[PDB]
Amino acid sequence: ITVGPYLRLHQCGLPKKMALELFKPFIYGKLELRGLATTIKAAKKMVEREE
Amino acid sequence: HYIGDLVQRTEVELLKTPNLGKKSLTEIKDVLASRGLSLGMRLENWPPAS
Amino acid sequence: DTIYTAGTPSGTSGDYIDDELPVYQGETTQTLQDYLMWQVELTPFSDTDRAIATSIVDAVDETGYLTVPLEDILESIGDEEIDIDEVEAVLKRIQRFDPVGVAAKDLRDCLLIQLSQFDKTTPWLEEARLIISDHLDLLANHDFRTLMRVTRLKEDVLKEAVNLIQSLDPRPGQSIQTGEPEYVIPDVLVRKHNGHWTVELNSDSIPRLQINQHYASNLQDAKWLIKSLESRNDTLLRVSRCIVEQQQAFFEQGEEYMKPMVLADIAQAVEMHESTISRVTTQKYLHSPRGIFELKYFFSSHVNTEGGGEASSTAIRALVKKLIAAENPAKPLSDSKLTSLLSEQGIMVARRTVAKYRESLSIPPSNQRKQ
């Protein structure tokens, strides 16, 4: 943990490489929802490549 | 008229379609599964305005 | 009694913190069926479709091929309203999971499934599709001439189509394979010095247990286990040493120099029941400079020798291999000609026995080896 002096009282700073790993199934669902990946394997590959 | 509209239709909805026997529904599922699709998907912001 | 002059270190600390390690539990792993079922769950099926998918994925082997016919699956479902076309639809849906082409009935189906997922811009796709769909044995048998007649195509297009064919995957299910294969530790070692083969048990595998006798019945019973282990390893060493003595020529000059020895010879040599000999040599290996061989490998059948004696079937197999290895590509040797050729050195084996040996060594017959 480091210090962010600019944040507001209800905010925290998260690295995005952690957020990609934590929120992965939500990302799968959102990718499938808008048609970017018709199947689960396509979304998994797209997330793996980090497009 | 487009693949997306057919894709978004659920199987129960197409079962009750008049003049559409179960054989035709199974054939449609076969031709969809051949290409890597299935009945019962869900897309937002459709049609794509084209 | 030598010291290994090179080796690999172990990644760990020499000393551990004094608290006891937790009991072993294990760790789950992902095989092919686990991945396929995971993809099945996240797929918009109905309930009956999911049941059929579970039944299908149950019957997929290690390589990714469907081992049972669809009639077995439809029978296993146990319902009467379900037809075979629903099973076909579910199978077609499953075959497009990752890896593409899994759960395929046979090689032709797998290749066609993989080919159907390309783009039309591919240089030679329809030619490959037609070749797989209709004329497959021609490509396997290396005809290249009647295929040109049937396809009505010149050399270049056919060659490129075959190049595309040999770019696909015939075993799509082996991408998700096991982590690391097991390895076997040899039981006994045979070295050579003084022109003689010394036999010695593996020191790294035989420790001497500390004798717990101080609290002293139980002491006598503990020594009984010691005597039993002593007798066991003594029997193993005696059997291995006798076997090595009998098969000295093979250890020096390799194959084609074995002797047709059976369990009776060992039983009479070590004065023991042949059942014990069968029991002790099972699932035990010996390490030689030539490789690692199971202790039961040196027992085989025999054939009559014209001048006298017998010839090991291993020697006959090796001779057949070495005769085939130096044949003319224009006119490959046939079975009768091979028998006639071997019937000049006192080898007397029937044509049927030659065919059996050839099938065992997995060598195609003469007509498939012609260039």
Swiss-Prot record, chain A:
Co-administration of salinamide and rifampicin or salinamide and myxopyronin suppresses the emergence of resistance to both antibiotics. Acetylated on several lysine residues in the presence of glucose. The RNAP catalytic core consists of 2 alpha, 1 beta, 1 beta' and 1 omega subunit. When a sigma factor is associated with the core the holoenzyme is formed, which can initiate transcription. The rRNA transcription and antitermination complex (rrnTAC) consists of RNAP, NusA, NusB, NusE (rpsJ), NusG, SubB, ribosomal protein S4, DNA and precursor rRNA; S4 is more flexible than other subunits. DNA-dependent RNA polymerase (RNAP) catalyzes the transcription of DNA into RNA using the four ribonucleoside triphosphates as substrates. Belongs to the RNA polymerase beta' chain family. This is DNA-directed RNA polymerase subunit beta'. It comes from Escherichia coli (strain K12). The gene is rpoC. The chain holds residues 355 to 405 of 1407 of the full protein.
UniProtKB/Swiss-Prot annotation, chain B:
Acetylated on Lys-22 and Lys-23 in the presence of glucose. PatZ controls acetylation of Lys-23 but not of Lys-22. Residues 1-50 are annotated as: Alpha C-terminal domain (alpha-CTD). Transmembrane segments: none annotated. The modification N6-acetyllysine is found at residues 22-23. It comes from the Bacteria. Homodimer. The RNAP catalytic core consists of 2 alpha, 1 beta, 1 beta' and 1 omega subunit. When a sigma factor is associated with the core the holoenzyme is formed, which can initiate transcription. Both the N- and C-terminus interact with different regions of transcriptional regulator CRP. The rRNA transcription and antitermination complex (rrnTAC) consists of RNAP, NusA, NusB, NusE (rpsJ), NusG, SubB, ribosomal protein S4, DNA and precursor rRNA; S4 is more flexible than other subunits. The N-terminal domain is essential for RNAP assembly and basal transcription, whereas the C-terminal domain is involved in interaction with transcriptional regulators (such as CRP) and with upstream promoter elements. DNA-dependent RNA polymerase (RNAP) catalyzes the transcription of DNA into RNA using the four ribonucleoside triphosphates as substrates. This subunit plays an important role in subunit assembly since its dimerization is the first step in the sequential assembly of subunits to form the holoenzyme. Part of the processive rRNA transcription and antitermination complex (rrnTAC). The complex forms an RNA-chaperone ring around the RNA exit tunnel of RNAP. It supports rapid transcription and antitermination of rRNA operons, cotranscriptional rRNA folding, and annealing of distal rRNA regions to allow correct ribosome biogenesis. Belongs to the RNA polymerase alpha chain family. This is DNA-directed RNA polymerase subunit alpha. It comes from Escherichia coli (strain K12). The gene is rpoA. The chain holds residues 276 to 325 of 329 of the full protein.
Swiss-Prot record, chain C:
This is RNA polymerase sigma-54 factor. One of its GO terms (cellular component) is protein-DNA complex. A motif (RPON box) lies at residues 350-358. One of its GO terms (molecular function) is sigma factor activity. GO terms for biological process: arginine metabolic process; cell motility; DNA-templated transcription initiation; nitrate assimilation; positive regulation of DNA-templated transcription; regulation of DNA-templated transcription; regulation of DNA-templated transcription initiation; submerged biofilm formation. Residues 262-281 bind DNA. The chain holds residues 89 to 475 of 477 of the full protein. It comes from the Bacteria. Sigma factors are initiation factors that promote the attachment of RNA polymerase to specific initiation sites and are then released. This sigma factor is responsible for the expression of enzymes involved in arginine catabolism. The open complex (sigma-54 and core RNA polymerase) serves as the receptor for the receipt of the melting signal from the remotely bound activator protein GlnG(NtrC). Keywords: Arginine metabolism, DNA-binding, DNA-directed RNA polymerase, Nucleotidyltransferase, Sigma factor, Transcription, Transcription regulation, Transferase. Belongs to the sigma-54 factor family.
